[PDB]
Design a protein around this ligand. Structure first.
Ligand SMILES: Cc1ccnc2c1NC(=O)c1cccnc1N2C1CC1
Lengths: 542, 408
C-alpha cells in the first residue's frame, strides 16, 4: 500500500557522492531468504531492480527476527547517512507528562511500516542501491533500490513526520476537539468525547490515513492504556511512576555500582529523600570496572533505606489549564534543593532536585535564585508559562540581599512560605568601620617559586602575630592573614587588606566556596558579630 | 519586482540557531500573526529539507498593546554580505524615532536567499512539531532590508528633505531618527507631517547627554578609612589620568592606626588632592572614535535602582559615560531595568555613531536569556557577553557628578 504524496526533495551533503561499499559473502540460507523477502517488496512496488548504470551500493544483511524462526532483512546505510544532507528537528524535545491534560480516552495507532508507504525523492533513489550476491559469485548479484522511504536512513523520520503532519492537517481541523501526537511510528490520539464518539472518530481517522495508502492497525490490534512513556506509565486521566526495582545482590562490581547510582540519581527527582553518598564512596580508587567492592555497612543501610523509598509507587496528575501553577522549593542541604509543582496542594504535576557544585564562590540566596530560574525555564517549556513561587526565604532577606548584590538578579512573582529551614544571610560585612573595635592590618606574601610564605598582622591596639608557611602560595598567604586576624580578633573587628581576593569577598560576600581555606574564613565571619573589611592598594605607604 | 540577488559572505553557511522556548501567550500571538502574513504571501511554510533556523519571538512597545513579531537575525546578519551616518542629530535639540519596518514587506526577496530566513514557531511542551516558515519578502530586522529598500526610501523622503534641510533624517534598520532644533511645537507638528508624507506612500534630546565628571568627596575632618578609600579610588583612577598622584595622602596613612581615627591633612596632601580634583574636572584627552573598531559598552549595577555605564573602544578611553535610574515601575526587578538600560544606551550609540555597541552585562547568561525578551522593545538586538564587574570600576563611577537640583 504505497501513498500518493509529493516527495520531499532530498540531496547529499555538499559535493559528496553516493555510497560505494562491497557486499559481504552469504550462506546458502542467508541468500535464499533475501531473494524471497526482496521478491516480496519487489512486487509490492517498494523496491525496483536496477542495472549497472548505478555505481553505488549499500551492504545488505539477513537476521532471523527473534520469536520467528523465519528470516527478515536489514540494510546498512551508515555510509549513505554520512553523505546525506541534514534536516531540522528530528526530535525537538519530547513532551513531558506533567505537561499533558487529562482525557477521557487515548488510543494509540501503530502506523508501523508507514515508512514504506511514503515515496522517496525519485532522483535520490539511486543512492539506495544494494546487492544480493549469488552462491559462488558466479552469476552477478541481483540489484535493487528503494522507491520508498527506507528503514534506517537518515531522512526517513523527518520526511515521514512532516508528510504525516500534512496528511493530518485537514482531519485536525475537522476535529479540533481531538488531540493527536505524532511520535516515531506511533500516533497518540486522545479526547474528551464519550467513548462511542471517540471510537467512531479514531475509525474516521484510521480511514483517513488509509486513503493515503496509509495502512494502520484496526481496533482489534492496537495498544492500550497505560502507556509507558519512557519513565512514566500513562493513563488518560493520570500517570504513575513504575516503581523501580533494585537488584538485591551478592558481589558488587564498580560498573555495577555506577549503573546503580545512575538509576538512583534518576529517581531522587521523583523520590527526594534518596541518598547515594556512601554508595558513591565505594568508587574512590576503583582500579578496574569489573573489580568487586566490599559494600560498607554504611552502604548497606543506605542501599537498604533506598529500596524502601522505591516501594511506594508514585501517582501524579495531568495539567489543568484552568488553574494557576504553584512551585514550592526546599533546601535539602547546602547546595541541594527540592521542588515540587502542583495546582491543587499535594496533587503533584512534577518534582525534582538539584545538587549545586559550590564552584568558585556562591551563597545560598544566589543558589535559591538559580533554582527558581531553572524551574522557571522548565515550566515554560512545558506549560508555556511560569509558576507563582512559594519560597523558604523572607522578603526582608531577599530585599536586603538583591538590592545590594553586584550582579543583576530577579525572582518572578513569589511568596514566602515559612517552611524551615529558611535561607538566610549567614553574615554581612559592615558598610563602614566599627567604632571601638580592634583594627587588624594584615598582610601575607609568598615566594612563588619556592612556595615559602609569611602571614600576619598588627593591630592599632598593639597586638601582633606572624606565621611562616611551607608549600603555600600567595593567594593562600593573603587569605591566611585575614584568617588569623579573624581568629584572634573577637566579636567585633576591622580588617584592612590589600588582597585582590578580599575585594572579591567584600563584593560577593560568599557563604560557600571550593576553597577549604576560604570556607574556613567564611565560618569565622559567620562567628563574628560585626566585621568591617577594607581594602587598600598594595605596595603603597599604607 | 525584479529582485536584487543577495548572497552570504563567501564560505559562510546559513544560520542554524535553536528556537528558545516561548510563553504560551507569545506562541499564540505569533501563530496568529504568521497565519495572516502567510495569507498575505509574505511568508510560506517550509519543509524539513530546509535545515536552517533563526529564533523568533514577540513583544509589545510601550504605548502599544498589539503584539509585534520580532526575529533575531543577528547571526544571519553576520553572515550576510555587505554592500551613511551624519553627526548632526548628535547635536540636535530633539530627535524622534519612527518605525518604518512596514516598508520592507513590500519588496520581494531573492528566491535563493529565502531558505536562509527560515524560522520556527515552537509548540508548548513539544505537543506538536514546530511550524516552519520562511520569508518571501524583505524581513524586518534583517540588515539586507534597509539596504535593498534604500532607493525607494531615499525617493520617498527627498521632498521632505529638500523642503526642510533644517531637519536630519537618519535610518538604522526598522527605525528612522528625525532631529530638529525647532521647538517642540514645530518639531512634533513637522514630524506628524512627515508621517503623513510616508503614509501617503503606503522625544529624545541629544545634547542633554553630557559625560559627568568624577567628583570627589569633601569632609571637614577625614578619617583613616575615608582616606584609604579615597586613595584606593584615586590609585586605580590613575589608569585614566596619569596626572593623579597619591603619595602625600598615602603618607598620612603610614602607621597602624584605627580606621575611625581622625587625621588632619598636611598642607602638602591638601594640594595633592586639590590638584587631582582639577585633573578630574575634565574627560581625558586623546580620545577619538575609530569607525574601524568595535564600540564597547560596560554596565555596572549600583543598587538602589542605579546603574552606571561607559562606552569605549579601548579600556579607560571612554568615548562616553553615564548613570541610569530605573524607570518608574521596575521598583523590584533588575532585568527589566537592565534591558531598559540596554535599549537606551544602544540608542545613543546609534544616534551618535550610528552603530550598536557590544554589551558586557553584569548578569548570569541564564538569567538574561530567560527574561530579556519579556521587556524588550526595539526592532534591533545588540551583541552581548556576560561578566563579573570588578569591584573597583564600580566604586569609581559611583563617584560621577549629578545636577545640584536636577531638571525642573
Ligand atoms: C505519549 C504521549 C505524548 C503526548 N500526548 C499524549 C501521549 N500519550 C498519552 O497516553 C496521553 C495521556 C494523557 C493525556 N494525553 C496523552 N496523549 C495525548 C495524545 C492524546
Amino acid at each position: 500500500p504505497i501513498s500518493p504524496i509529493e516527495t520531499v526533495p532530498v540531496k547529499l551533503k555538499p559535493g559528496m557522492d553516493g555510497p560505494k561499499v562491497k557486499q559481504w559473502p552469504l550462506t546458502e540460507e542467508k541468500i535464499k531468504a533475501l531473494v524471497e523477502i526482496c521478491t516480496e517488496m519487489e512486487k509490492e512496488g517498494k523496491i525496483s531492480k536496477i542495472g549497472p548504470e548505478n555505481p553505488y551500493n549499500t551492504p545488505v544483511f539477513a537476521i532471523k527476527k527473534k520469536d520467528s524462526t523465519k528470516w527478515r532483512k536489514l540494510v546498512d546505510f551508515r555510509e549513505l547517512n554520512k553523505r546525506t544532507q541534514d534536516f531540522w528537528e528530528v526530535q525537538l524535545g519530547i513532551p513531558h507528562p506533567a505537561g499533558l491534560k487529562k482525557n477521557k480516552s487515548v488510543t494509540v495507532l501503530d502506523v508501523g511500516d508507514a515508512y514504506f508507504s511514503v515515496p522517496l525523492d525519485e532522483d535520490f533513489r539511486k543512492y539506495t542501491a544494494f546487492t544480493i550476491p549469488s552462491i559462488n559469485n558466479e552469476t552477478p548479484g541481483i540489484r535493487y533500490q528503494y522507491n520508498v522511504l527506507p528503514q534506517g536512513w537518515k531522512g526517513s523520520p523527518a520526511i515521514f513526520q512532516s508528510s504525516m503532519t500534512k496528511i493530518l492537517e485537514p482531519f485536525r481541523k475537522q476535529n479540533p476537539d481531538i488531540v493527536i501526537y505524532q511520535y516515531m511510528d506511533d500516533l497518540y490520539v486522545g479526547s474528551d468525547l464519550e467513548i462511542g464518539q471517540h471510537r467512531t472518530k479514531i475509525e474516521e481517522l484510521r480511514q483517513h490515513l488509509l486513503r493515503w495508502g496509509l495502512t494502520t492497525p484496526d481496533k482489534k490490534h492496537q495498544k492500550e492504556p497505560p502507556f509507558l512513556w519512557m519513565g512514566y506509565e500513562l493513563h488518560p486521566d493520570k500517570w504513575t511512576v513504575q516503581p523501580i526495582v533494585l537488584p538485591e545482590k551478592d558481589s558488587w562490581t564498580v560498573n555495577d555500582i555506577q549503573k546503580l547510582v545512575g538509576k538512583l540519581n534518576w529517581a531522587s527527582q521523583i523520590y527526594p529523600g534518596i541518598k547515594v553518598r556512601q554508595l558513591c564512596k565505594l568508587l574512590r580508587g576503583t582500579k578496574a570496572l569489573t573489580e568487586v567492592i566490599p559494600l560498607t555497612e554504611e552502604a548497606e543501610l543506605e542501599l537498604a533505606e533506598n529500596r524502601e523509598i522505591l516501594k511506594e509507587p508514585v501517582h501524579g496528575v495531568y495539567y489543568d489549564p484552568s488553574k494557576d501553577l504553584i512551585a514550592e522549593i526546599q533546601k535539602q542541604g547546602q547546595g541541594q534543593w527540592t521542588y515540587q509543582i502542583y495546582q491543587e496542594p499535594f496533587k503533584n504535576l512534577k518534582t525534582g532536585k538539584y545538587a549545586r557544585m559550590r564552584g568558585a564562590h556562591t551563597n545560598d540566596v544566589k543558589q535559591l535564585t538559580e533554582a527558581v530560574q531553572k524551574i522557571t525555564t522548565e515550566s515554560i517549556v512545558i506549560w508555556g508559562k511560569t509558576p507563582k513561587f512559594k519560597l523558604p526565604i523572607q522578603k526582608e532577606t531577599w530585599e536586603t540581599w538583591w538590592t545590594e548584590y553586584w550582579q543583576a538578579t530577579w525572582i518572578p512573582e513569589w511568596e514566602f512560605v515559612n517552611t524551615p529551614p529558611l535561607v538566610k544571610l549567614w553574615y554581612q560585612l559592615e558598610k563602614e568601620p566599627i567604632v571601638g573595635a580592634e583594627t587588624f592590618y594584615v598582610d601575607g606574601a609568598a615566594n612563588r617559586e619556592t612556595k615559602l610564605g609569611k602571614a600576619g598582622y598588627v593591630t592599632n591596639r598593639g597586638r601582633q602575630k606572624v606565621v611562616t608557611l611551607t608549600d603555600t602560595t600567595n593567594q593562600k598567604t593573603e587569605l591566611q592573614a585575614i584568617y588569623l586576624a579573624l581568629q584572634d580578633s573577637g566579636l567585633e573587628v576591622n580588617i584592612v587588606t590589600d588582597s585582590q581576593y578580599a575585594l572579591g569577598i567584600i563584593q560577593a560576600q560568599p557563604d560557600q566556596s571550593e576553597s577549604e581555606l576560604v570556607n574556613q574564613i567564611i565560618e569565622q565571619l559567620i562567628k563574628k558579630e560585626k566585621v568591617y573589611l577594607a581594602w587598600v592598594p598594595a605596595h603603597k605607604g599604607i
